[PDB]
Design a protein around this nucleic acid. Structure first.
Ligand SMILES: NC(=O)c1ncn([C@@H]2O[C@H](COP(=O)(O)OP(=O)(O)OP(=O)(O)O)[C@@H](O)[C@H]2O)n1
Ligand SMILES: [Mg+2]
Length: 476
RNA sequence: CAUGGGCCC
RNA sequence: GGGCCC
């Protein structure tokens, strides 16, 4: 998105952390090319000659405007994927009850309790237990006063820039490539779930290549659904965007909002409203009130759905803008916002799309960048989706998500203070799929020190998840 | 003891 | 309440 150009303000929004993340006993064994991000332009490690606050805003290279015939081409594609979308999800997209928006239907996790509240509830000391009864699902004064307000469209706000205390490859750290999180006022996040909460539920619970979304899925059982499907095709590309989130041009955004969330598909007129408030934003990083047109607010409600709908309409628009007769069945695709796998028989050309894609402000590039350009052949066992490769499992003939040891090792070098035992239980079931030998190497560090799930119990868990009746087949 | 949105104990 | 992927 284009910055008008940031201002001064007298109020000053603290963030600049020091990492809650810390080395582990694994840390010294694995010596990973991975550290906590920078949470301070003062932080030593950091290359010298680096103002951390520069880069955070170097993802705003402008805001591609779109010809009038591209806006029509894009409109069609969005109404088309929208036709598909509501064909599979139905048209029951009535507003959600403040009770659900807080509580959550069957497929919409509740809103989280102890979570930051956005503005200005932190310019005025208050957490989200002070305007909502999380586990009674209950508004209070201003939430309900603003509920009333956005109902009128006479509501307006600002986004609280943050920094992702997270691990990152060492180099990205030194570039000061910290990931931003733009936190929305919690009232907003709530109205949004009312406006489009039943949509997102249905999305979550019909994920699959049919709707091109993997949001809602379980990389751990769903990998089988997905692997067999994608191995039915002669060509499978692993595409990488870049700044995906921030380069959603203003026109692309306003069109999909208009095309996906109309009232003719069951929504309430104000679902376009809450959504379009997301185009031109005000990001308050500290005393800098940075004002931006374009992009998405990474972490603005439904952020992953939106970005997924958008990726889907982009591909189809890039194919539609290069050849004729391209329908949704021309290909197949699954994304999770940024991430995307695509497949096709038609021997399609993806280095011929880069430009058509650059007409929306987006820069695709191959995943295997140590070639040069998009090639044919690649099956679904050369790609990555969500940081997991597709491998088939010896013992079962089933597909399974596998992360590079170097990643797994990264995750296992750093924990928040006294989380190490819990984290490990969690990472145990990721590392299952790396086999018995590596699972073991990967955990030597913590022996006689922490509890380590047996490789065997994690396997039979998995086997029962992927298709329980094969659990029951390792029997008769 | 970051936002979203998912899912895992 | 924790971990991950996005
Ligand atoms: N926590 C959040 O609010 C959140 N997390 C993931 N997302 C959606 O998923 C995308 C992940 O962006 P990345 O960190 O991969 O970077 P990028 O902007 O896509 O590209 P690159 O790393 O190539 O510069 C984002 O761009 C965003 O659309 N939002
Ligand atoms: Mg990828």
């Amino acid at each position: 998105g284009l910055i008008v150009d940031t201002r001064d303000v007298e109020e000053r929004v603290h963030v600049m952390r020091k990492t809650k993340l810390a080395p582990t006993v694994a840390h010294g064994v694995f010596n990973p090319e991975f550290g906590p991000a920078a949470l301070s332009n003062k932080d030593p490690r950091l290359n010298e000659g680096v103002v951390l606050d520069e880069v955070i805003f170097s993802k705003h290279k402008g805001d591609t405007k779109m010809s009038a015939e591209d806006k029509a081409l894009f409109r069609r594609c969005a109404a088309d994927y929208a036709s598909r979308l509501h064909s599979v999800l139905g048209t029951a997209n009535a507003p959600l009850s403040i009770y659900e928006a807080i509580k959550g239907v069957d497929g919409l996790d509740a809103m989280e309790p102890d979570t930051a509240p956005g503005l200005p509830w932190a310019l005025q000391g208050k957490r989200r237990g002070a305007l909502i009864d999380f586990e009674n699902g209950t508004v209070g004064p201003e939430v309900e006063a603003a509920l009333k307000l956005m109902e009128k469209r006479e509501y307006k706000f600002a986004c609280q820039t943050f920094l992702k205390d997270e691990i990152r490859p060492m180099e990205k750290v030194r570039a000061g490539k910290t990931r931003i999180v733009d936190v929305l006022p919690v009232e907003h996040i709530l109205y949004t779930r009312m406006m489009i909460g039943r949509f997102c539920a249905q999305m979550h619970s019909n994920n699959g290549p049919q709707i091109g979304s993997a949001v809602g899925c379980n990389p751990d059982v769903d990998w089988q659904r997905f692997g067999t499907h994608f191995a039915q095709y002669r060509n499978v590309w692993d595409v990488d965007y870049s700044a995906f989130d921030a380069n959603h041009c203003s026109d692309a955004m306003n069109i999909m909002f208009e095309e996906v969330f109309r009232t003719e598909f069951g929504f309430h007129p104000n679902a376009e409203w809450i959504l379009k408030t997301l185009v031109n934003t005000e990001h308050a990083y500290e005393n800098k009130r940075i004002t931006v047109e374009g992009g998405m607010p990474s972490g603005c409600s439904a952020t992953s759905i939106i970005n997924t709908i958008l990726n889907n309409i982009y591909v189809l628009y890039a194919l539609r803008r290069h050849y004729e007769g391209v329908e949704l069945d021309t290909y197949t695709m699954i994304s999770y916002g940024d991430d995307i796998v695509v497949a096709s028989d038609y021997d399609l050309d993806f280095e011929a799309l880069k430009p058509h894609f650059k007409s929306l402000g987006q820069t695709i590039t191959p995943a295997d960048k140590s070639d040069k350009g998009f090639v044919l052949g690649h099956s679904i066992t050369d790609v990555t989706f969500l940081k997991r490769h597709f491998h088939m499992d010896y013992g079962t003939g089933f597909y399974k998500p596998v992360m590079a040891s170097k990643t797994l090792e990264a995750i296992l070098s750093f924990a928040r203070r006294g989380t190490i035992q819990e984290k490990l239980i969690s990472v145990a079931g990721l590392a299952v799929h790396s086999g018995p030998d590596e699972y073991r190497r990967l955990f030597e560090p913590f022996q006689g020190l922490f509890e380590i799930p047996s490789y065997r119990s994690l396997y039979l868990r998995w086997v029962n998840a992927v298709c329980g009746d094969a659990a029951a087949l390792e029997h008769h």
